[PDB]
Amino acid sequence: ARVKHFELLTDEGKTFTHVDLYGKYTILFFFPKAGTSGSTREAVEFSRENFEKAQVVGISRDSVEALKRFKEKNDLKVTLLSDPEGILHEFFNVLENGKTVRSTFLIDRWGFVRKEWRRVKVEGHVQEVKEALDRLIEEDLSLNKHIEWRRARRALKKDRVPREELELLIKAAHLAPSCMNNQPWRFVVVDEEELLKKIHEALPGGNYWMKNAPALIAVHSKKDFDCALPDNRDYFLFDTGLAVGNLLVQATQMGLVAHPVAGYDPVKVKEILKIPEDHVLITLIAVGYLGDESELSEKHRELERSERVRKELSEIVRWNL
Amino acid sequence: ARVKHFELLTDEGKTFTHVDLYGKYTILFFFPKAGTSGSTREAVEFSRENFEKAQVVGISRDSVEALKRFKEKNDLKVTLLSDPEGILHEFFNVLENGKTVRSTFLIDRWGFVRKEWRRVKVEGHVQEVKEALDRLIEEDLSLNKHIEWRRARRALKKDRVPREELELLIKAAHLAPSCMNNQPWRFVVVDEEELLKKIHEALPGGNYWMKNAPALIAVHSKKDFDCALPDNRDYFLFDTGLAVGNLLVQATQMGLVAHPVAGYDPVKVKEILKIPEDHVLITLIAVGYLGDESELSEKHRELERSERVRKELSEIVRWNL
Numbered sequence: 183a184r185v186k187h188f189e190l191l192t193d194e195g196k197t198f199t200h201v202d203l204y205g206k207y208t209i210l211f212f213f214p215k216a217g218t219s220g221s222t223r224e225a226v227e228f229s230r231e232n233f234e235k236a237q238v239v240g241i242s243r244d245s246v247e248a249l250k251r252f253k254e255k256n257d258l259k260v261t262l263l264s265d266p267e268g269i270l271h272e273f274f275n276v277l278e279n280g281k282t283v284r285s286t287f288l289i290d291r292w293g294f295v296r297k298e299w300r301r302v303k304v305e306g307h308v309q310e311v312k313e314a315l316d317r318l319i320e321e322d323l324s325l326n327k328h329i330e331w332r333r334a335r336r337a338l339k340k341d342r343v344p345r346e347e348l349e350l351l352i353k354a355a356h357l358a359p360s361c362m363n364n365q366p367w368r369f370v371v372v373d374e375e376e377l378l379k380k381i382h383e384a385l386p387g388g389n390y391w392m393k394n395a396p397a398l399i400a401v402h403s404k405k406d407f408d409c410a411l412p413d414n415r416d417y418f419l420f421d422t423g424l425a426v427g428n429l430l431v432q433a434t435q436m437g438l439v440a441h442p443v444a445g446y447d448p449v450k451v452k453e454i455l456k457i458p459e460d461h462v463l464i465t466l467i468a469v470g471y472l473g474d475e476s477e478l479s480e481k482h483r484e485l486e487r488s489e490r491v492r493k494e495l496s497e498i499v500r501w502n503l
Numbered sequence: 504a505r506v507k508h509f510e511l512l513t514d515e516g517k518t519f520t521h522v523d524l525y526g527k528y529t530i531l532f533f534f535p536k537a538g539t540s541g542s543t544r545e546a547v548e549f550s551r552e553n554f555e556k557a558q559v560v561g562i563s564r565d566s567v568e569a570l571k572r573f574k575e576k577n578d579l580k581v582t583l584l585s586d587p588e589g590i591l592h593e594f595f596n597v598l599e600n601g602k603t604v605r606s607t608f609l610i611d612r613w614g615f616v617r618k619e620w621r622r623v624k625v626e627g628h629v630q631e632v633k634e635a636l637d638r639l640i641e642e643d644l645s646l647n648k649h650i651e652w653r654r655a656r657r658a659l660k661k662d663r664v665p666r667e668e669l670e671l672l673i674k675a676a677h678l679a680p681s682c683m684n685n686q687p688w689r690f691v692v693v694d695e696e697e698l699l700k701k702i703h704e705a706l707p708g709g710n711y712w713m714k715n716a717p718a719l720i721a722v723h724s725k726k727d728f729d730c731a732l733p734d735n736r737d738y739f740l741f742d743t744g745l746a747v748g749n750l751l752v753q754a755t756q757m758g759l760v761a762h763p764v765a766g767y768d769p770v771k772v773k774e775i776l777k778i779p780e781d782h783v784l785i786t787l788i789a790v791g792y793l794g795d796e797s798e799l800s801e802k803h804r805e806l807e808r809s810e811r812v813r814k815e816l817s818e819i820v821r822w823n824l
């Protein structure tokens with residue numbers, strides 16, 4: 183769970199709070215009492231490592247003065263928290279039979295606990311924690327796996343997608359932010375065969391692959407549904423884009439292809455789906471489980487099995503001036 | 504890894520391929536030989552259990568006929584694959600000195616191996632696999648955690664965000680899809696202090712909170728950078744929204760607040776950053792680690808850890824007609 187708001191004094195008499203957890207990874211190590219052999223070893227061993235993108239914080243029920251002495255005598259280079267009242271000891275549930283059970287936690291940049299060790303054995307502990315931290319940082323500070331995996335796949339199974347799954351795609355989309363929280367996005371989820379077959383007639387030849395999709399999501403909006411600000415800053419389609427971005431990530435996580443297209447007759451599709459004529463039908467999203475690439479044109483099959491194609495980063499981003 | 508393309512015959516003599524793994528979760532259990540005591544028990548126990556949203560597939564080097572008999576004798580309700588040539592036995596690496604090691608795999612809807620058991624002990628195995636599958640399905644088929652956690656947070660620390668982390672936000676954005684792969688999005692990442700101060704003067708007072716951000720990302724595009732199709736379907740801002748949507752997910756995973764705004768003077772900011780006059784500056788994204796909400800206005804403070812505010816789903820989605 184997330185670490186609650188709190189305030190504790192450090193070995194330096196300073197106030198350490200939840201805010202001091204934010205923006206860093208934290209190794210939080212609970213020890214029973216400053217000065218003992220095992221706890222001295224643990225603190226010294228944590229102190230002598232160099233943790234990439236993390237801080238080390240020791241915590242016990244000791245007094246500030248005791249912790250200060252503990253640090254001074256061992257030349258410790260970590261923060262120590264005095265928790266005489268056991269506020270965090272209780273929150274992390276490290277007390278048993280009234281005594282502290284040596285325990286260690288990894289906390290992320292939002293303050294969420296990501297890993298724990300209970301009934302810690304000091305021998306080998308720091309190295310195990312170090313290795314777990316490196317793995318956690320590798321996981322979080324690398325490209326999101328769903329963003330990376332999402333492709334404009336065109337091979338779709340005909341198997342029906344359960345409505346509860348389709349609905350989750352919409353729920354995720356709806357959690358996008360928007361100007362003034364206008365939420366300008368609108369969706370028509372189509373999973374009725376007869377309706378689908380009518381929409382198929384409004385598709386160009388190159389979108390034959392959409393005909394396998396057991397579901398299509400029509401995404402529409404209207405300018406006055408959102409902010410329209412100076413210098414041509416109309417937000418309705420941008421914000422709807424934020425929503426569809428979420429939708430594709432959610433689909434990819436769920437093992438669904440969600441492929442937004444522009445290839446269709448908008449007037450016909452709006453007519454079929456009874457979408458107001460003054461709305462923009464900005465995309466039609468084909469949704470389905472992954473199917474059989476051998477049904478695709480050679481061109482589409484090659485796009486599908488080939489690597490991502492993008493401009494060099496320098497063509498789309500500049501740093502300062 | 505992802506499962507190779509293959510075709511094998513089932514106990515019914517039907518062809519089963521990797522396409523038959525797609526769109527389902529699969530428990531694939533290898534056993535050395537049909538009819539032995541342990542393998543009989545394993546198959547019987549898998550068949551008796553219920554696995555929601557998954558299929559159970561046994562596989563050995565036995566003939567189709569031997570598998571048919573094995574199924575009939577034990578009233579098995581699973582698919583069995585005949586693999587005399589050891590095509591999947593080799594791929595899954597279950598052969599030790601040419602002999603099959605009892606092994607089981609969980610494969611997701613994309614065909615990725617998500618969990619494995621090797622040198623399997625039959626007793627308790629089916630239950631262990633059920634629990635692991637249930638957990639797998641729980642995570643994949645629930646709301647994406649980063650989408651769920653992303654909020655328009657306004658308390659930002661002044662702490663520098665390393666360029667390697669800022670680079671990753673842009674990389675994730677650039678992996679968005681776009682009409683004709685046009686990639687219409689453009690970014691100026693600002694982290695130089697004096698440049699940030701100039702931008703601050705073009706912000707309205709109500710966006711005071713942005714002035715603590717150590718980085719601002721200016722997002723701009725132009726209509727002719729993307730598809731412009733009939734019925735008022737201009738794609739440049741929609742597609743840029745897809746990109747920013749990815750950016751926000753990536754930031755959230757990394758423990759960064761990424762908060763897109765519309766409160767700024769676009770002409771002033773474009774001038775400061777040398778963005779061409781005919782571009783639309785559609786958002787400024789404040790990026791930073793989470794800071795102290797106590798520094799926010801009373802209204803913003805209440806919002807900082809408030810519940811999500813959205814329209815009811817029925818207001819933004821319709822099913823079919």
Ligand SMILES: Cc1cc2nc3c(=O)[nH]c(=O)nc-3n(C[C@H](O)[C@H](O)[C@H](O)COP(=O)(O)O)c2cc1C
Nearest residue numbers: 333334389442443444445465679680681682683684
């Ligand atoms: C708004 C939009 C419309 C698209 N329209 C089509 C389409 O009509 N037909 C099609 O085969 N692909 C279409 N695509 C898919 C793109 O061609 C694809 O995203 C792009 O080539 C990049 O490939 P990638 O997403 O796998 O990285 C569309 C994508 C977007 C964002």
Ligand SMILES: Cc1cc2nc3c(=O)[nH]c(=O)nc-3n(C[C@H](O)[C@H](O)[C@H](O)COP(=O)(O)O)c2cc1C
Nearest residue numbers: 358359360361362363654655710763764765766786
């Ligand atoms: C395009 C856009 C512009 C926004 N502009 C501002 C802004 O100028 N100032 C601000 O305090 N919040 C702004 N927001 C944040 C929204 O108000 C916020 O996303 C909305 O209230 C919903 O909150 P949530 O994202 O936490 O769910 C903007 C959001 C978007 C998508």
